[PDB]
Amino acid sequence: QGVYAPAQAQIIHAGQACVERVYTIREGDTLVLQCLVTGHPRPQVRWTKTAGSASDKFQETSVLNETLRIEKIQRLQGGRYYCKAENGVGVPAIKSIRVDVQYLDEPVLTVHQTFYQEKTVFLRCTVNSNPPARFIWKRGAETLSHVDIYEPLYTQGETKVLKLKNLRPQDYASYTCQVSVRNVCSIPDKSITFQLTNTTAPPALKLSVNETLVVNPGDNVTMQCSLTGGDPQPEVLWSHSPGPLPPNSLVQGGNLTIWRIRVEDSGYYNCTAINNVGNPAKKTVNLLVRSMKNATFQITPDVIKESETIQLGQDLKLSCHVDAVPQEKVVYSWYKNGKPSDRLLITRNDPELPPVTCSLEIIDLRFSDYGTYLCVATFQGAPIPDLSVEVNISSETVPPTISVPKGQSTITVREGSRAELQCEVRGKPKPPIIWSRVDKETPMPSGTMTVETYDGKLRLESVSRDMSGTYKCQTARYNGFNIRPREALVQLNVQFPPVVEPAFQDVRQGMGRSVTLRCTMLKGSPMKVATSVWRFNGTLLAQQDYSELKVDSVSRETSGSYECSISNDVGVSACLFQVSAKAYSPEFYYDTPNPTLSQKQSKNYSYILQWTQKEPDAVDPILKYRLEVRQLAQRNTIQTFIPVQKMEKGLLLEHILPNLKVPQSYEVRLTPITSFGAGDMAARIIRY
Amino acid sequence: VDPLVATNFGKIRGIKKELNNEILGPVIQFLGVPYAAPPTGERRFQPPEPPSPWSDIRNATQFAPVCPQNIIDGRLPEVMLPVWFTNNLDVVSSYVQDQSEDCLYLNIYVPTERDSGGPKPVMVYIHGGSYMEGTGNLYDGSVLASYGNVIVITVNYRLGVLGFLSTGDQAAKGNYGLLDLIQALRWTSENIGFFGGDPLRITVFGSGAGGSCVNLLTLSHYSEGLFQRAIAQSGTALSSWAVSFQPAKYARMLATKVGCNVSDTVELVECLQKKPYKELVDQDIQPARYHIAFGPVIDGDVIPDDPQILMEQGEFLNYDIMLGVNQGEGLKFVENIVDSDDGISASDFDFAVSNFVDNLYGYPEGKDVLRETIKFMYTDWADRHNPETRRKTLLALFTDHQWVAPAVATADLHSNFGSPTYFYAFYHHCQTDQVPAWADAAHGDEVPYVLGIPMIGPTELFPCNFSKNDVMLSAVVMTYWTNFAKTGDPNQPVPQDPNRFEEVAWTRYSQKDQLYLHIGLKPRVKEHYRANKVNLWLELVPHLHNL
Ligand SMILES: *[C@@H]1O[C@H](CO)[C@@H](O[C@@H]2O[C@H](CO)[C@@H](O[C@@H]3O[C@H](CO)[C@@H](O)[C@H](O)[C@@H]3O)[C@H](O)[C@H]2NC(C)=O)[C@H](O)[C@H]1NC(C)=O
Ligand SMILES: *[C@@H]1O[C@H](CO)[C@@H](O)[C@H](O)[C@H]1NC(C)=O
Ligand SMILES: *[C@@H]1O[C@H](CO)[C@@H](O)[C@H](O)[C@H]1NC(C)=O
Ligand SMILES: *[C@@H]1O[C@H](CO)[C@@H](O)[C@H](O)[C@H]1NC(C)=O
Ligand SMILES: *[C@@H]1O[C@H](CO)[C@@H](O)[C@H](O)[C@H]1NC(C)=O
Ligand SMILES: *[C@@H]1O[C@H](CO)[C@@H](O)[C@H](O)[C@H]1NC(C)=O
Ligand SMILES: *[C@@H]1O[C@H](CO)[C@@H](O)[C@H](O)[C@H]1NC(C)=O
Ligand SMILES: *[C@@H]1O[C@H](CO)[C@@H](O)[C@H](O)[C@H]1NC(C)=O
Ligand SMILES: *[C@@H]1O[C@H](CO)[C@@H](O)[C@H](O)[C@H]1NC(C)=O
């Protein structure tokens, strides 16, 4: 390639700046970076940014523009930017620049008090700033070692501390930290002052409730957090964990009220006081709302005899459980066709089973034990309602077995629609089913690894292909037999339309020569070409995992747009080819001094129009170019023909436009002509 | 059979290779593949240009000439090179005896086969000892490729003067060797698909200065989209010998040596371009101790700024990263000061530190307190009189400073800025009769395991009598390395299948917990590798500089 030149970039500075490779500006101002580029064909330019995805100044910022513009810049918008410029010839051009937004926040001033001879106070001054700040202390007059000043570890220049080793009376004054950023980017210094007095003292709090507070749902609880010391007067603030305070909870300020408290409102409520003196005071109260949920039973046949079924002459455990907030306060009552138990039937409150689970055992099972057992969980004198779990034991009760009904082992559905997976469980009682995925360890529509279901149905509203795989269904260990869970698998096909290749392809070839088009299917379920249909300019044609078409003679009559419509049994997708013997667009040459002043008079200049032909040998040879010249101002165009002598990839072509009015601009449209006719036209604007 | 592949530059013929191992399948080798144009004539001290195409079938059955170098004990630095290299120069010499300035060639190893189907991952090995010598030809990727079912590529880039000379201005911007590596990666991205490789899963890895190269590439915008993951073994961009900070100084010393030292930097470079490459290579240019003369430079383009500044300010893309160090990197640092009793005297200890402080910490005021503080920290106060314990701690000092501290700094910053990071410590090796019996895993000792050398038994380059445990550990390392390449997770998709790594999942590294994998015959995950000594160099010592 003779004239084709690799891209070349250069960054230039604009907009508001201050004062080599870095572009420093004040926060809030406007950034303007321009990337000048050269090379042929004219390379494209995009400004991008390079930042750690997961921290601090990060934005995804890909703009296709020779000018980067950030108005009212911010701290985070800062960082390193690079301008990339490419044109196909050679290696892309890259230039780097660091934008260094600068600032100086208001300084924070805090103070801390502290053998037994001298009292010592530490005045700590902190500020966030770019560049690193400079600190100056003063007590009306500037202070030096004459007391001590220094920067501690675990600070990157953002902090200085003023140490008053011996607190003499003159020291009881107004201390002010004056922090400066060296006035770079014309940024003013800033100051903060504090009134150090012998009454100065950190905050202190008193709470109107105990360490831990238990309450019933609906109850109104109000908590008074009051100051008991602090100078300056500290600010009191309530907070909640987990999550925010509201709804139904209002902060008057100091006073915290919770109306109609719900069970989910339980947790820690912390009152904190701050006055920038010493450590902030904090009082913490843990509010526990009572509740009982998820009462469950378990049938545990003889474990030592290795049984999974109720058999006469065996031990039979009937457990009981409920989830409660004051878990230690629950009490269970076992009834059996009424409420009874010493001999043969015994109570056990805490086995290896879940926490706080009451379970009676029946030694030497007997037909007389066949009955309806009931467990009643309750709170000692609590207004909340009791909870119960009934569990009928009889000859009929039997461990469960699970299976897939008929042939729904593999069930296929189209993407988007709803899907329903099915397992059917048998036994008395029937435990709920727990669905999980096996092919991989991923979560589910519900967002967790498993879902509970009693009907043995798993419903999928908006089924996604991601869900396509293998699913496990198994019996619960609760609300039934506490036995090795029975398992069964089901396949889930999520069908979706095909995707073919290429989606679009601009095909060029001589007039007498032939060409073959292939449309290939990569993904698609079913992964089979149900049918492939080649179409030409709307009309259908005549006719394997893919489809092929051969254009015998690329002529004006056969040249056009071919469409291969590959389709599975669910949807259709098509490749689209553009066949022709059109020459490619000419490539305007932009890097030359063009205009020629006619004696600076007659209002005439001339322009040296230059360009190259992209891939001259891709089609029939270029005979002549049609040159059009319009002035923007008027519709009429001057049409001319440049005749090509011959050309090779990279040869520069030239043409002078003799009569052009000195101040106006012109549009230039340049079209190649081959035996096939007009190729792809290109356009450009020239100017004096 | 006859491996022929048509690339964008022409047809290429490969060569089938059987491995000396019944479980490993054979591989296809493409040796001496041009990935750039010869950097000769006006192309010397200039960026690489794409290679010229050919119309026939080009043979790739043998290694191409290596880049100009002089390792025949031509005053090379032993403290920077891997012990396996320096202890076997006669064999190493045979790999670089055939030289030419036209040396921009790469080698491709393709497996002949597993489980998941589709384009296979590509692992590009970047060699490097001191930037002055070496060749990818020394690293046979056959076993790694065959065992892991991945494509392995070794690259040859311009070395020393020819690859890194810089005048500090536009006359010679330097980093030519890095540009060749970038160009090699470009070639790979554009042509590896023809070999069955996945350009969307390219992992770059290297040991020593090769590891330094890997990290420097991750800080360059030129690497965008080129590769997705990086593995850096015993090498960072933050060490004292990773970058040449005074290129102009050394460029003029060379010029003076060859009669090219003129005022104009442009005329100086043109003068060098007229000189025979051998004349430039054979010159004696000694750099400051623990530093380099000719190597990567901060040009503001390839390398936008000091790696330290770029990393601290998170000015780098988020690649998947795996990095680590060996228990006893600095063997050669003390090996030369050890007495006939395998111990180090208190006076020798003081001397080493004194030399150490002066060379790395050239501060005029305060070097005294520094030397004394460093001695105290690296003194074992329990058994303080033992000359052998003194040897170990001194070795640790150099190891901690040159390898451990920089690696942790890199890992901390990468993870902190969102890059998935994995950290390891190599506490195993195979002792030859050429290394002291008291030595632990030294610099480069992990290479044979990563390359699967134990599986094909002792080689001319790696003569150690590998044990069954060496084979087992080698398999494990290769499993982890290729797993990272395949998914970005050392634990996926191949499980560790007695194998002591069966239940050992390699947790991701974070600055808060700093979990790392202890690689040895008793592997397991630990936390905060040498936290105390590492923090000394990274936090306290810098403070003693007086800001
Ligand atoms: C109602 O309460 C019962 C407990 O009585 C809950 O059943 C429990 O569910 C959890 C998770 O669903 C089970 O955790 C399991 O831990 C084992 C550890 O060996 C592990 O292998 C399992 O994969 C699972 O993570 C727990 O075992 C199970 N307890 C019993 C007794 O079955 C039930 O989920 C609660 N349901 C509702 C709606 O509140
Ligand atoms: C580039 O961006 C500037 C402002 O950011 C705008 O004025 C101009 O029209 C844009 N031009 C192009 C070619 O993107
Ligand atoms: C503190 O200063 C005040 C002056 O406002 C003085 O009255 C008082 O005695 C001093 N001592 C204490 C302990 O407050
Ligand atoms: C809670 O407050 C509401 C009004 O705020 C009142 O009507 C209700 O009786 C109160 N209930 C209790 C238990 O204090
Ligand atoms: C409240 O304090 C507890 C410990 O006392 C702590 O665990 C919790 O995070 C705190 N919550 C808030 C909002 O500060
Ligand atoms: C507490 O504040 C609530 C509103 O936040 C108010 O309704 C209630 O009367 C207050 N009670 C006390 C004792 O301060
Ligand atoms: C169990 O027996 C009780 C006894 O009254 C009956 O009400 C119930 O319907 C039976 N079936 C159950 C609990 O499933
Ligand atoms: C097909 O339609 C396009 C639409 O412009 C046209 O250019 C082409 O000539 C048509 N082909 C034939 C064979 O008429
Ligand atoms: C200037 O251009 C006009 C036509 O636009 C032409 O008639 C005239 O002769 C030209 N004069 C010169 C000096 O070129």
From Swiss-Prot, chain A:
GO terms for biological process: neuron migration. In the embryonic brachial spinal cord, selectively expressed by medial lateral motor column neurons, some populations of dorsal root ganglion neurons, and interneurons. Residues 592-688 form the Fibronectin type-III domain. It is a lipid-anchor; GPI-anchor. Glycans are attached at N65, N198, N210, N220, N255, N270, N294, N392, N537, N604. Disulfide bonds join C35-C83, C125-C177, C225-C271, C320-C375, C423-C473, C519-C564. Keywords: Cell membrane, Developmental protein, Differentiation, Disulfide bond, Glycoprotein, GPI-anchor, Immunoglobulin domain, Lipoprotein, Membrane, Neurogenesis, Repeat, Signal. GO terms for cellular component: plasma membrane; side of membrane. Interacts heterophilically through its MAM domain with proteins in axon-rich regions and through its Ig-like domains with proteins in differentiating muscle. Required for radial migration of cortical neurons in the superficial layer of the neocortex. This is MAM domain-containing glycosylphosphatidylinositol anchor protein 1. The chain holds residues 19 to 733 of 949 of the full protein.
From Swiss-Prot, chain B:
Disulfide bonds join C67-C103, C260-C271, C430-C464. Glycans are attached at N59, N261, N465. GO terms for molecular function: amyloid-beta binding; cell adhesion molecule binding; identical protein binding; neurexin family protein binding; PDZ domain binding; scaffold protein binding; signaling receptor activity. GO terms for cellular component: asymmetric, glutamatergic, excitatory synapse; cell surface; dendrite; dendritic spine; excitatory synapse; filopodium tip; GABA-ergic synapse; glutamatergic synapse. It is a single-pass type I membrane protein. It comes from the Eukaryota. Keywords: Autism, Autism spectrum disorder, Biological rhythms, Cell adhesion, Cell membrane, Disease variant, Disulfide bond, Glycoprotein, Membrane, Secreted, Signal, Synapse, Transmembrane, Transmembrane helix. It is found in: Cell membrane; Postsynaptic density; Synaptic cleft; Synaptic cell membrane. GO terms for biological process: AMPA glutamate receptor clustering; AMPA selective glutamate receptor signaling pathway; calcium-dependent cell-cell adhesion via plasma membrane cell adhesion molecules; cellular response to calcium ion; cytoskeletal matrix organization at active zone; establishment of protein localization; excitatory synapse assembly; heterophilic cell-cell adhesion via plasma membrane cell adhesion molecules. Expressed in the blood vessel walls (at protein level). Highly expressed in brain through prenatal stages, and at lower levels in pancreas islet beta cells. Residues 1-547 are extracellular. Changing L216P: In AUTS20; risk factor for disease development; decreased function in dendritic spine formation; decreased protein abundance; does not localize to the plasma membrane but is retained in the endoplasmic reticulum. Interacts with neurexins NRXN1, NRXN2 and NRXN3. Interaction with neurexins is mediated by heparan sulfate glycan modification on neurexin. Interacts with NLGN3. Interacts with AIP1 and PDZRN3. Interacts (via its C-terminus) with DLG4/PSD-95 (via PDZ domain 3). Interacts with GOPC. Belongs to the type-B carboxylesterase/lipase family. It is linked to Autism 20: A complex multifactorial, pervasive developmental disorder characterized by impairments in reciprocal social interaction and communication, restricted and stereotyped patterns of interests and activities, and the presence of developmental abnormalities by 3 years of age. Most individuals with autism also manifest moderate intellectual disability. The transmission pattern of AUTS20 is consistent with autosomal dominant inheritance. This is Neuroligin-1. The gene is NLGN1. The chain holds residues 51 to 656 of 863 of the full protein.
